[PDB]
Amino acid sequence: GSHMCDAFVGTWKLVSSENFDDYMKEVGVGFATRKVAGMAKPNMIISVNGDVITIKSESTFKNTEISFILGQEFDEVTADDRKVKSTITLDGGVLVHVQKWDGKSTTIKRKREDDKLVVECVMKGVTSTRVYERA
Length: 135
Ligand SMILES: COC(=O)C1=C(C2=[SH]CCC2)C[SH]=C1NC(=O)[C@H]1CCCC[C@H]1C(=O)O
What we know:
Elements: H1 3-8, E1 10-18, H2 20-26, H3 31-39, E2 43-49, E3 52-58, E4 63-69, E5 74-77, E6 83-91, E7 94-101, E8 104-113, E9 116-123, E10 126-134
Helix pairs in contact: 2-3
This protein binds ligand WK9.
């Protein structure tokens, strides 16, 4: 087993959100999409198979799935249809996901906090916090 397995693997449901509309604005999402995307309550499924981590997000609005090896950059088409270059590392027990596109950068941090998985999303000055519980 591994730290990653024990901490993150499983099925998680969104239970609260803060500032997500403002985060979406900062990453360039337009009005109609922000409105419909902001209603979504995704399930997040995290799995590990050997060195490969998979993060799936499933909702009424969009489904996404990424698989990656820690430290190894990959192509990602985000839920909001940005084509980014992503690298995910495990830093002091926090999954740190950096996305680069068009000269811009956003960082998504995923951490365990008590029984929750807390996702912090930062674009320039704007932070959104997305809190998940076990499904
Ligand atoms: C920018 O859009 C997004 O980031 C975004 C979505 C859209 S689709 C159209 C508009 C917005 C849908 S789901 C999502 N982001 C996440 O699910 C992760 C990954 C990053 C931030 C929040 C995280 C979270 O666990 O909720």
